[PDB]
């Protein structure tokens, strides 16, 4: 169905030295395919995905000289941004870049990104029309004005529009096999024992992909919130996820009270109860 | 393939 | 101020004497020390330059004296000849932006031959 | 080696002025300074490989072009007479402390 391509840049200063730790991240439907790191032996672009070995050297020199030269692009701007926030170069400031763009079900550009931001906090951003820009602070309306006379917008959107759009169906054509999978949770009920006459059942959901899941447990068909416990979603290594659910609840009633759990790739919600072995 | 940023901060 | 200041503005010196060409600085934060050396009709040019980490630097006849406790250097040009009649700028870079160049007023040097 | 030309350039004000810089070295970074009578040349902006960096005290007056690494060029939109001064043009073979070589230079005289 849908599909999208992001390139996640990091570019954290360190301070007594020249240049900062530029680390650019590529990803196709949420998974990793392309990295750099410039605290690496030979900073140059890597794959990540085995599909990814069939580029060419001609491809990662061509690549490898693109994040050479955002590591300076990166470099310079840290310093403006100093001298916008009245910051000391003595401390470590962080700049992130989120570019890409989502196709629709058509194999179709439905939505153009580029998000910056300083501190960890939104700086500036381009606008879905890719012709506008947002800015937070009074110090980003400086890069705005900077940016709409050189017109850095229209430069982004050639490529939003075109390139990135281009070679995501090239991306799409040399590893179909692997990157449309919809992994179904495995989910079962543990029993637990807890203080007096209560119990603790603990809906557990294991191997799935993507991480986007829900759990809930119900009484009597109304679904149970602010008492029940849950864990917030955790790979497992292997590429997989991982969540559970627990309620506390009085032995002898656990038959009645029932777990539902909301996935994709799964044709119609997962229902089940604690099994007595 | 990545892009690369045009005028600075 | 967060500036380089250099002093004299303009210097007379008769041939064969030493001159003295002071540059001043408040940033700690400097680490590289080169001075320029323009002619009329003609653009700066590297002459001699110094680091932090040494209080003297020899080049022939130019020597640069600098001390970083009292934030203050001096270019030096023992014997005085009227082919060194120029413009001479003191600039200050810092690891920040090393690419950067904080130049100062300058310093009209004239050898009275 | 890095060459300036003309040596003097005269402007209308309101009329756009342009400044060519040449090197043909294979240098990477090219700056462009502003130089005023008994004060500092003032650093305006830098063209690094194909990147630009503008002061932010003087990008809304000067703009700058560079179609390849020879050629970089200072773009006025309208003239007035606070811009007249000389303007130095600088190159360097990376973005740090290696030696900055200046050109000749071109005095604008800007008049009603």
């Known amino acids: 169905g849908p599909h999208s391509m992001r390139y996640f840049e990091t570019a954290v200063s360190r301070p007594g030295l020249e240049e900062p730790r530029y680390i650019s991240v590529g990803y196709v439907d949420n998974k990793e395919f392309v990295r750099f790191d410039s605290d690496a032996e030979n900073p140059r672009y890597e794959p990540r995905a085995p599909w990814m070995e069939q580029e060419g050297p001609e491809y990662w020199e061509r690549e490898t000289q693109k994040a050479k030269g955002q590591e300076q692009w990166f470099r310079v701007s840290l310093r403006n941004l100093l001298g916008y926030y009245n910051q000391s170069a003595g401390g470590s400031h962080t700049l992130q870049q989120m570019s890409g763009c989502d196709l629709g079900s058509d194999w179709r550009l439905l939505r153009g990104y580029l998000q910056f931001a300083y501190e960890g906090r939104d700086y500036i951003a381009l606008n879905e029309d890719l012709k506008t820009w947002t800015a937070a602070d009074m110090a980003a309306q400086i890069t705005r004005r900077k940016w709409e006379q050189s017109g850095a917008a229209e430069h982004y959107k050639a490529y939003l529009e075109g390139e990135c759009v281009e070679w995501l169906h090239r991306y799409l054509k040399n590893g179909n096999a692997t990157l449309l999978r919809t992994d179904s949770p495995k989910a079962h009920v543990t029993h637990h024992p807890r203080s007096k006459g209560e119990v603790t059942l603990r809906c557990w959901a294991l191997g799935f992909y993507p991480a986007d899941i829900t759990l809930t447990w119900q009484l009597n068909g109304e679904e149970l919130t602010q008492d029940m416990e849950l864990v917030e979603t955790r790979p497992a290594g292997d590429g997989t996820f991982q969540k559970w659910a627990s309620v506390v609840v009085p032995l002898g009633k656990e038959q009645n009270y029932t777990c539902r759990v909301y996935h994709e790739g799964l044709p119609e919600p997962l229902t089940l109860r604690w099994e007595p072995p | 393939a990545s892009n690369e940023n045009m005028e600075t901060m | 101020q967060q500036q380089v200041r250099q002093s004299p503005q303009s210097l007379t010196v008769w041939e064969g004497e030493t001159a003295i060409l002071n540059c001043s600085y408040e940033?700690?934060?400097?680490?590289?020390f080169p001075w320029y050396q323009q002619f009329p009709g003609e653009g700066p040019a590297l002459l001699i330059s110094?680091?932090?980490?040494?209080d003297k630097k020899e080049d022939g006849r130019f020597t640069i004296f600098f001390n970083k406790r009292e934030k203050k250097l001096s270019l030096h040009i023992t014997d005085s000849q009227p082919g060194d009649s120029a413009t001479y700028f003191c600039?200050?870079?810092?690891?920040?932006?090393?690419?950067?160049?904080?130049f100062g007023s300058g310093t009209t040097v004239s050898v009275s031959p | 080696t890095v060459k300036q030309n003309p040596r003097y350039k005269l402007a209308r004000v309101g009329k756009p002025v342009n400044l060519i810089c040449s090197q043909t070295?294979?240098?990477?970074?090219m700056y462009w300074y502003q130089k005023k009578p008994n004060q500092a040349p003032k650093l305006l902006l830098f063209?690094?490989?194909?990147?630009?960096?503008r002061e932010a005290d003087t990008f809304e007056k000067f703009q700058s072009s560079r179609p390849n690494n020879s050629f970089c060029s200072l773009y006025i939109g309208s003239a007035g007479l606070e811009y007249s001064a000389m303007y130095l043009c600088?190159?360097?073979?990376?973005?740090?402390?290696?030696?900055?070589?200046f050109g000749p230079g071109t005095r604008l005289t800007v008049l009603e």
């Open positions: 110094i680091r932090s980490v040494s």
């Open positions: 600039a200050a870079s810092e690891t920040s932006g090393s690419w950067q160049l904080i």
């Open positions: 600088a190159s360097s073979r990376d973005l740090g402390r290696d030696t900055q070589y």
């Open positions: 070295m294979n240098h990477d970074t």
């Open positions: 940033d700690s934060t400097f680490n590289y």
């Open positions: 063209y690094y490989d194909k990147i630009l960096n």
